[PDB]
Each structure stands twice: as C-alpha cells, then as structure tokens.
Design an enzyme around this catalytic site. Structure first.
Site, PDB file in Angstrom:
ATOM      1  N   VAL A  85      15.021  -7.047  -1.446  1.00  0.00           N
ATOM      2  CA  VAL A  85      15.629  -6.720  -2.496  1.00  0.00           C
ATOM      3  C   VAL A  85      14.911  -5.612  -3.244  1.00  0.00           C
ATOM      4  O   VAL A  85      13.894  -5.318  -3.061  1.00  0.00           O
ATOM      5  CB  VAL A  85      15.811  -7.895  -3.505  1.00  0.00           C
ATOM      6  CG1 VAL A  85      16.495  -9.198  -2.803  1.00  0.00           C
ATOM      7  CG2 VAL A  85      14.320  -8.279  -3.976  1.00  0.00           C
ATOM      8  N   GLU A 128       4.697  -3.295 -12.284  1.00  0.00           N
ATOM      9  CA  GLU A 128       6.485  -3.086 -12.405  1.00  0.00           C
ATOM     10  C   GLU A 128       6.697  -4.004 -13.609  1.00  0.00           C
ATOM     11  O   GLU A 128       7.358  -3.719 -14.234  1.00  0.00           O
ATOM     12  CB  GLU A 128       6.946  -3.434 -11.189  1.00  0.00           C
ATOM     13  CG  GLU A 128       6.750  -2.270 -10.147  1.00  0.00           C
ATOM     14  CD  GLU A 128       7.072  -2.756  -8.594  1.00  0.00           C
ATOM     15  OE1 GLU A 128       6.721  -1.860  -7.601  1.00  0.00           O
ATOM     16  OE2 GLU A 128       7.564  -4.019  -8.486  1.00  0.00           O
ATOM     17  N   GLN A 153      13.449  -4.963  -6.341  1.00  0.00           N
ATOM     18  CA  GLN A 153      12.604  -5.717  -7.387  1.00  0.00           C
ATOM     19  C   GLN A 153      12.506  -4.823  -8.777  1.00  0.00           C
ATOM     20  O   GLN A 153      12.566  -5.487  -9.821  1.00  0.00           O
ATOM     21  CB  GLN A 153      11.185  -5.871  -7.020  1.00  0.00           C
ATOM     22  CG  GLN A 153      10.415  -6.773  -8.034  1.00  0.00           C
ATOM     23  CD  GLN A 153       9.221  -7.334  -7.418  1.00  0.00           C
ATOM     24  OE1 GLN A 153       9.125  -7.773  -6.146  1.00  0.00           O
ATOM     25  NE2 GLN A 153       7.835  -7.089  -8.071  1.00  0.00           N
ATOM     26  N   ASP A 188      -6.537   5.239   1.064  1.00  0.00           N
ATOM     27  CA  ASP A 188      -6.464   3.874   0.530  1.00  0.00           C
ATOM     28  C   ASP A 188      -8.070   3.613   0.585  1.00  0.00           C
ATOM     29  O   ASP A 188      -8.760   3.733   1.572  1.00  0.00           O
ATOM     30  CB  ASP A 188      -5.895   3.103   1.377  1.00  0.00           C
ATOM     31  CG  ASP A 188      -5.486   1.851   0.853  1.00  0.00           C
ATOM     32  OD1 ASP A 188      -6.372   1.213   0.044  1.00  0.00           O
ATOM     33  OD2 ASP A 188      -4.399   1.066   1.064  1.00  0.00           O
ATOM     34  N   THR A 245      -4.943   0.370  -4.815  1.00  0.00           N
ATOM     35  CA  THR A 245      -4.017  -0.205  -4.994  1.00  0.00           C
ATOM     36  C   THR A 245      -3.764  -1.604  -5.909  1.00  0.00           C
ATOM     37  O   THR A 245      -2.759  -1.910  -6.009  1.00  0.00           O
ATOM     38  CB  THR A 245      -3.225  -0.567  -3.775  1.00  0.00           C
ATOM     39  OG1 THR A 245      -3.896  -1.285  -2.959  1.00  0.00           O
ATOM     40  CG2 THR A 245      -2.997   0.881  -3.069  1.00  0.00           C
ATOM     41  N   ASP A 292      -7.171 -11.199  -4.324  1.00  0.00           N
ATOM     42  CA  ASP A 292      -7.484 -10.686  -5.917  1.00  0.00           C
ATOM     43  C   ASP A 292      -6.349 -11.144  -6.663  1.00  0.00           C
ATOM     44  O   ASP A 292      -6.404 -10.657  -7.887  1.00  0.00           O
ATOM     45  CB  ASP A 292      -7.357  -9.037  -5.626  1.00  0.00           C
ATOM     46  CG  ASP A 292      -5.987  -8.574  -5.263  1.00  0.00           C
ATOM     47  OD1 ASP A 292      -5.354  -9.071  -4.461  1.00  0.00           O
ATOM     48  OD2 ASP A 292      -5.916  -7.530  -5.582  1.00  0.00           O
ATOM     49  N   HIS A 350       3.251 -13.935  -7.522  1.00  0.00           N
ATOM     50  CA  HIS A 350       1.975 -14.145  -7.030  1.00  0.00           C
ATOM     51  C   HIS A 350       1.024 -13.228  -7.620  1.00  0.00           C
ATOM     52  O   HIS A 350      -0.159 -13.309  -7.313  1.00  0.00           O
ATOM     53  CB  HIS A 350       1.785 -13.861  -5.411  1.00  0.00           C
ATOM     54  CG  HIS A 350       2.197 -12.350  -5.188  1.00  0.00           C
ATOM     55  ND1 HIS A 350       2.986 -11.506  -5.961  1.00  0.00           N
ATOM     56  CD2 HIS A 350       1.718 -11.647  -4.091  1.00  0.00           C
ATOM     57  CE1 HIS A 350       2.941 -10.157  -5.242  1.00  0.00           C
ATOM     58  NE2 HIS A 350       2.313 -10.276  -4.163  1.00  0.00           N
ATOM     59  N   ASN A 405       0.843  -4.529  -7.535  1.00  0.00           N
ATOM     60  CA  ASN A 405       2.257  -3.601  -7.593  1.00  0.00           C
ATOM     61  C   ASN A 405       3.378  -4.372  -8.470  1.00  0.00           C
ATOM     62  O   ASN A 405       4.150  -3.865  -9.240  1.00  0.00           O
ATOM     63  CB  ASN A 405       2.632  -3.439  -6.233  1.00  0.00           C
ATOM     64  CG  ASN A 405       2.056  -2.133  -5.553  1.00  0.00           C
ATOM     65  OD1 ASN A 405       1.832  -1.197  -6.112  1.00  0.00           O
ATOM     66  ND2 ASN A 405       1.616  -2.268  -4.461  1.00  0.00           N
ATOM     67  N   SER A 406       3.447  -5.716  -8.105  1.00  0.00           N
ATOM     68  CA  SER A 406       4.479  -6.464  -9.047  1.00  0.00           C
ATOM     69  C   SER A 406       4.025  -6.516 -10.448  1.00  0.00           C
ATOM     70  O   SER A 406       4.884  -6.622 -11.208  1.00  0.00           O
ATOM     71  CB  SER A 406       4.700  -7.755  -8.412  1.00  0.00           C
ATOM     72  OG  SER A 406       5.267  -7.816  -7.289  1.00  0.00           O
ATOM     73  N   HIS A 465       0.905  -1.144  -0.141  1.00  0.00           N
ATOM     74  CA  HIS A 465       0.223   0.044   0.063  1.00  0.00           C
ATOM     75  C   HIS A 465       0.896   1.071   0.053  1.00  0.00           C
ATOM     76  O   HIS A 465       0.475   2.252  -0.619  1.00  0.00           O
ATOM     77  CB  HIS A 465      -0.993  -0.045   1.296  1.00  0.00           C
ATOM     78  CG  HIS A 465      -1.891  -1.298   1.209  1.00  0.00           C
ATOM     79  ND1 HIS A 465      -3.215  -1.055   1.080  1.00  0.00           N
ATOM     80  CD2 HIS A 465      -1.631  -2.435   1.584  1.00  0.00           C
ATOM     81  CE1 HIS A 465      -3.911  -2.147   1.086  1.00  0.00           C
ATOM     82  NE2 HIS A 465      -2.663  -2.979   1.538  1.00  0.00           N
TER      83      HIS A 465
END
Ligand SMILES: O=c1ccn([C@@H]2O[C@H](COP(=O)(O)OP(=O)(O)O[C@H]3O[C@H](CO)[C@H](O)[C@H](O)[C@H]3O)[C@@H](O)[C@H]2O)c(=O)[nH]1
Length: 432
Positions: free
Chosen positions: A312, A337, A314, A99, A122, A353, A329, A333-334, A12
């Site tokens: 790390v 990116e 990412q 949020d 988010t 989700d 997963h 956000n991943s 978040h």
C-alpha cells in the site's frame, strides 16, 4: 556530482531516493549505484518509477557474481568491482554517500576515490548514539553481565534499559555483535553522517553527537530530515474507503516490509482490533486461514475494518485525514513519515532498534509503547491488551497536540529555517 549506493530492502531504498530528490532539487548530478539483481520487486518497481521521474540521474549497475542478507554478503565481497566503475565516471565525482551497513566494505573504495565520503544512517540519531557508544560498552566489559542500563551523555532518551538493547548485541557469538564492533570504530574515518531526522524529535541526540559527548572523535552529523514522501513512490479502493470515514478515526496498522510474526500472535491482533471499537486499516505481509469467523463477521458487520495483503501507499494513508492513529513497529522510516503527517504512534517494537526508536517518540510526547510487550516471539500479547492500548492511545488527545507540534517542526525543518536546508547547503559548499 554525488554518488549514492543504498543497501537492500525498501527500508533502505526509500530514504535514499528521498535524499536524491532533495539533492536534485538543490540542483545536483546524482549517480545512483544499483546492485543488480535487486532483491524484492517493490525495490525494482520503485527504481524504474524513480528513474522515469528523474531521467537526469545516472544509474550505475553493480553486477554481483552468484535474499536480503544474501545480497549483503555478495556486495561486501565484491566491493572492489566499484572502484574501476566509479573512477572512470564523468563528470568527476565530488562526494559519495552509502549505507551504514556497507561502511566497512566501501571505506577502502571511498578513500581510494579521494572524495568526501559519508554514510546515510537510515535509523534514528539516538540509535546512532547507541551504535557509536557500543564499542565503549564492550570494552568496559561488565557486559552483558551487570549491565542494567545504557546511559549515553545527553541523548534524547533518558536511559536505555537492558530490555531495549537489541538481543543479538548481548550474545557474544552473533553477527550484529561482530558487525557493531567492526563498523562503529570506522565512523571516525568519515567526513560526516547523514541521518533522516530533525530537531523537533531528536534535539538532544543531534546536539550530543556534534558536541562530542557521545564518543570521542565523531565526524559532524547532519539532520537532513524529514525525508518527506515523494510522488514517484506512488504507483484505488483503499482511498475511497478512507474518504467516507470520520476524520482522525481510522487506526493504521503496519509492521514494516517483512512482518515476520507468527500465526499465534496474528489472531490476537485482529481480535484486539475489533475489541477496541475503532475502525482500522490493517496491512499484513505473508512472506491463510488465521482470521476467526466471529471476527471476520464483525469486521464486515460493524463496517469498520480493512485488511490488505499488498504494498500500500503508506504516505497517502498517513496523509488521509481519516487516519488519526498509527500502530507501528517504529521503523524509523515509518516514524519520520508519521511525524510528517502528525499521526500519533502506538508503539509495538519487534526487532533490533525498534525499542529505542519507540522511546524516542515516547519522550517527544506523541507516542506510547508498552515495555511489557517485549520482542517478537518472547510471549503472546492478548487481544484485550491490544484493544486497551488502542483505546488508551485513541482517547488520548494530548498525543495529537504534541503530534501537531511535531508536524509543525517537521514542516519547519524543510524550508526557510529548515535544518535540512541548512545541512544540505552546508554540504554543497564543502563539495566545491
Ligand atoms: O505496506 C507498506 C509497508 C511499508 N511501506 C513503506 O516502506 C518503508 C518501510 O520502512 P520502515 O522503517 O517502516 O520498515 P522496515 O522494516 O523496512 O525498517 C527497517 O529498516 C529501516 C531502514 O534501515 C530501519 O532501520 C528500521 O528500524 C528497520 O526496522 C516506509 O517508507 C513505509 O512507508 C509502504 O509504503 N507500504
């Protein structure tokens, strides 16, 4: 003058501060609300590193009376402490973005301030469609009895099966069931919704929400994505290993900020990584004797594997030309990116989700996930299935073609064309 208030967790805070960097580049005075004490160290480390890069912002301490789900409860019970803090705020506020998990405790505070209040969802816009359509689902209560699919009119996913529905939403005595039925009907009492997404991945979902075909009475949603990674997020043995690797050959593996898997499944993951034959960079979070000696040797004998237990960067790893794949997963956000760097995603959804987010990238043609793997803890995925999925995705050059086009649309969604630039500037004139 904009006021920001994120929830707990790095999932978040990272998109929220990336939004602040976008608002600051559009020349704003951002007042960041910080509920202290903050939960994780990675959060307060990201904060002071963000505060140092932007000393112009005004941090506002939200002191709560006496972990992630625990700070959840103290904020919503003490949200009335913010309206004396935000009213006596100079310069006068012009907006307020918080949020979505805090839409209920902050709506009375936001309405009392008299400023155009928003939320920053988010997650994906497609999940937001499921979140908005959920009250309509529960009222036609052939649910969860006869419910086989969830067909939202005109979203980017063809049809959301029952398998992809977050499990606690199918149980009538759960927190998220009550939270969905209480938070979602309050979207209509908002000025708008910001979502970290762009037209290149969720064109149909963005147009369906603004077109009024999801649920009746929604405010305008703004695709301010992609939230590109910033430099204040960067805090060097890993980069030196990736440099001496053939480009597009490294498999990045990460399951987010928690990674609450079991010892049974972790053995198969590392076993599947070595059975695929590709060099990999595994990132695990403990919160230790699990790896097999036959696999630890092959990781070092074949000169292929990296395993780390640390926060790390990412963005650097996804940005490195050696990384060509992403076992994710599918946290949004991943995902965003990974889209920004054009790295094809191998989908392994775990909770919430993440099955819906995985289908969003699957329909886009730049991601592949297995419905049969199911939620975490439902069964045990063997290493052969993991080695085959990695072999299937890495050999699949069609994904990098679509991943490249998704990268082009991502780089085009931030600049002159830029649905982000269009949305942000459209908000600036409203905030006059
Ligand atoms: O070792 C790591 C692990 C993560 N990250 C970064 O931390 C964030 C992690 O966000 P993800 O969405 O990938 O993972 P989360 O588990 O935090 O995500 C959860 O919260 C998100 C925000 O609400 C979404 O809802 C998502 O679907 C949900 O699983 C990203 O910036 C990622 O790059 C790192 O830098 N290093």
């Amino acid at each position: 003058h904009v006021a920001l208030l994120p929830s707990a967790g790095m999932g978040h805070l990272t998109p929220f501060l990336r939004l602040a960097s976008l608002l600051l580049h559009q020349h704003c005075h951002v007042t960041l609300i910080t509920p202290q004490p903050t939960v994780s160290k990675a959060e307060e480390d990201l904060l002071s590193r963000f505060l140092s890069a932007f000393p112009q912002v005004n941090q506002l301490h939200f002191h709560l009376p006496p972990p992630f789900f625990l700070q959840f409860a103290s904020i919503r019970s003490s949200s009335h402490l913010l309206t004396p803090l935000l009213s006596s705020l100079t310069p006068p506020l012009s907006s307020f973005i918080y949020d979505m998990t805090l839409i209920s405790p902050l709506l009375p505070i936001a309405e009392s301030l008299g400023v155009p209040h928003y939320i920053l969802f988010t997650s994906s816009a497609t999940m937001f469609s499921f979140f908005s359509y959920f009250p309509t689902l529960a009222k036609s209560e052939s649910f969860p009895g006869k419910l086989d699919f969830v067909e939202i009119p005109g979203v980017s996913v063809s049809s959301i099966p029952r398998s992809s529905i977050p499990p606690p939403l199918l149980v009538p005595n759960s927190l998220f069931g009550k939270l969905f039925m209480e938070d979602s009907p309050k979207l209509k009492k908002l000025h708008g919704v910001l979502v970290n997404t762009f037209e290149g991945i969720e064109k149909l979902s963005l147009e369906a929400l603004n077109g009024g075909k999801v649920v009746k009475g929604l405010p305008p949603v703004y695709g301010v994505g992609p939230f590109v990674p910033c430099e204040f997020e960067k805090v060097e043995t890993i980069s030196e290993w990736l440099d001496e690797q053939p480009s597009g050959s490294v498999v990045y593996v990460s399951f987010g900020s928690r990674t609450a898997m079991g010892r049974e499944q972790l053995r198969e993951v590392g076993d599947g990584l070595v059975k695929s034959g590709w060099r990999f960079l595994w990132v695990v979070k403990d919160k230790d004797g699990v790896l097999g000696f036959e696999l630890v040797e092959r990781m070092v004998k074949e000169k292929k594997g990296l395993v780390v237990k640390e926060w790390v960067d990412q963005s650097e790893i996804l940005g490195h030309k050696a990384v060509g794949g992403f076992v994710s997963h599918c946290g949004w956000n991943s995902v965003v990116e990974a889209a920004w760097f054009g790295v094809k995603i191998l989908g392994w959804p775990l909770h919430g989700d993440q099955k819906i987010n995985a289908e969003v990238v699957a329909k886009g043609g730049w991601g592949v996930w297995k419905e049969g793997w199911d939620w975490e803890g439902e069964r045990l995925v063997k290493g052969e299935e993991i080695g085959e999925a990695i072999r299937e995705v890495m050999n699949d050059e069609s994904l990098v073609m679509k991943a490249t086009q998704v990268k082009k649309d991502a780089r085009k969604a931030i600049s002159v064309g830029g649905g982000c630039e269009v949305a942000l500037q459209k908000l600036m004139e409203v905030w006059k």
